[PDB]
Design a protein around this ligand. Structure first.
Ligand SMILES: OC[C@H]1O[C@H](OCC#Cc2cccnc2)[C@@H](O)[C@@H](O)[C@@H]1O
Ligand code: NI
Length: 158
């Protein structure tokens, strides 16, 4: 089991860390959503699907910088929605193919009433999403840590 990003970089077998840059709507009003869909960016595969089933959860989603201070939000993981920052590890998604399949995570962020001006700065860290991988074969228990960076400023109009 390993993951890579579109562009991109890779996290090899045994887990590790990678940095991900996301394009964000430059302008978002109170009551609107920023949608950050990582499912077009992060892809994973099972290295031995005939003998092994891989289980993948979103172990934790954490907010940083302008997202932490100026947004509230939810995370959608494989069809189910959760508070973001998360309060528990999700149910598992099965990886059972050698073909790269998306990691089905998307953030829905909405400005708090105190956001105004540049709410998210370009190049800044906005979120960490931890992928936890296990299997039905051995004791492997690995973390794939995705540091999510804003590609551009996001302005909340005043
Ligand atoms: O993707 C399947 C497995 O690939 C890697 O495992 C390598 C192996 C193997 C193997 C398969 C069949 C028999 N003996 C060993 C690890 O990422 C492991 O965690 C993962 O579950
Ligand atoms: Ni592989």
């Amino acid at each position: 089991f390993a993951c890579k990003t579109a562009n991109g970089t890779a996290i090899p077998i045994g887990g590790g860390s990678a940095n991900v840059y996301v394009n964000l709507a430059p302008v978002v009003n109170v009551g609107q959503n920023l949608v950050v869909d990582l499912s077009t960016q992060i892809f994973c595969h099972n290295d031995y699907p005939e003998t092994i089933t891989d289980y993948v959860t979103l172990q934790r989603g954490s907010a940083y910088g302008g997202v932490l201070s100026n947004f509230s939000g939810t995370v959608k993981y494989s069809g189910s929605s959760y508070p973001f920052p998360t309060t528990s590890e999700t149910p598992r998604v099965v990886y059972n193919s050698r073909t790269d399949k998306p990691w089905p995570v998307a953030l829905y962020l909405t400005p708090v009433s105190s956001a105004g001006g540049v709410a998210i700065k370009a190049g800044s860290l906005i979120a960490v999403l931890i992928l936890r991988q296990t299997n039905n074969y051995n004791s492997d228990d690995f973390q794939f840590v995705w540091n999510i960076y804003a590609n551009n400023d996001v302005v909340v109009p005043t």
